[PDB]
Every structure is written in structure tokens, then in C-alpha cells.
Amino acid sequence: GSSGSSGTGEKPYECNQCGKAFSVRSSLTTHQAIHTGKKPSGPSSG
Template structure:
């Protein structure tokens, strides 16, 4: 990228990245008007409106909007996390635990 020096292996990745600098968001959502710099992000976003969850968890069959799922979920509120450590930190909200003093 001539603007910031970031390198890409494919020209299409560079073109998509350059939209960060130009402010071009050519893919609008037909439901809410939110705009995206590439078509794949619009596709993922559209699943919010359709409730489409095409990627089932192999363990529990819960569906997700993206392949990158959140396999660690809070037993209290159901919020999902990508890493077990993130879940442990979140769980403190429910327990009131504050392991670090001021």
C-alpha cells in the first residue's frame, strides 16, 4: 500500500485495504444501510437480519454466522468467547471476583 506500506499477497486484498484510506464502502446492506468495504463482510452482516447461522458446532450443533465461532460460552448469560481465558475474565462479572487491588 502506497499510503501506509502494508503488504499483501494478492492484489484484491490490496484493493480492499485501500478503501480504509479512501473511505470507499461500496457494499451497502439493503436492510439497514450499513456499508462495507468488501462483499464477504456484507454477507456475514446480512445474517443478522436473516438469522441465518450456517455453521453448526460439531459438539453441540449450535449454529454460528461465521466459521470462526465462539466455542466458550458463559453458563450464566450465554455470551460466547474465542478463548477460555476470556471466558474466565468475563465470569468475574457474575461472581463479583476482583483479583487485583488498586
């Protein structure tokens, strides 16, 4: 599609998991909590 920030593009920080927009990136981080989605590696590796 059309990808580019040259005109139309408001609310750069918004949630998609449940659908909740925000204002400050700091806010999105506070909401990311309930939206668990991490992938920490283990102490061993192959």
C-alpha cells in the first residue's frame, strides 16, 4: 500500500492488540503491560 509520513499521519502511538490510541509514547508503554508479548532467551544456546 502507501507507506510514508508526508502528509496524513496522526497518532503515531496507538494500540492494536485491543484497539486503544494514545497521545504520549509513555502512555502506550503503561498499556503494553497488560499486553504481554516478550521473548526472553535462555541461559543456554545451541
